[PDB]
Amino acid sequence: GSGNSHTTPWTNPGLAENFLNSFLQGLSSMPGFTASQLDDLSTIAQSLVQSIQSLAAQGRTSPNKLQALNMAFASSLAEIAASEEGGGSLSTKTSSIASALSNAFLQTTGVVNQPFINEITQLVSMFAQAGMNDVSA
Numbered sequence: 001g002s003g004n005s006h007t008t009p010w011t012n013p014g015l016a017e018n019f020l021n022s023f024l025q026g027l028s029s030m031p032g033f034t035a036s037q038l039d040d041l042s043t044i045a046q047s048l049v050q051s052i053q054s055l056a057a058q059g060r061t062s063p064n065k066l067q068a069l070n071m072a073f074a075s076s077l078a079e080i081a082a083s084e085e086g087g088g089s090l091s092t093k094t095s096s097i098a099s100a101l102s103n104a105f106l107q108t109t110g111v112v113n114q115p116f117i118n119e120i121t122q123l124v125s126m127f128a129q130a131g132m133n134d135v136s137a
Contacts, residue, residue, distance in 0.1 A: 023101065074124050
């Protein structure tokens with residue numbers, strides 16, 4: 001047959017793996033996570049690919065299903081981001097992820113979008129803080 005009019009990272013397990021590989025590789029050298037956390041993160045990454053294959057095997061991908069995978073990706077980052085030994089603050093960690101994401105975007109599809117990366121980083125910082133955990137004077 002034919003098609004080719006739909007190509008997205010989350011939709012194709014190979015493109016998803018490319019995204020995760022490029023992102024993880026670039027993020028390790030960032031002041032966000034550590035090579036140690038990046039190892040655990042490889043497992044957390046592959047767990048996405050397995051679920052992507054499940055849907056791809058039927059040639060069906062509901063928007064809300066593929067989106068729930070994206071929400072869960074940020075959700076997973078908040079857990080290891082709240083964990084100790086991952087740099088220092090949550091703010092700098094979520095900030096480094098945005099910088100690693102753009103580099104990964106250049107490798108997956110070759111197109112980086114500033115606000116698309118921001119909304120993704122807000123999920124992590126929102127999940128972790130879930131209010132105002134710090135004060136000011």
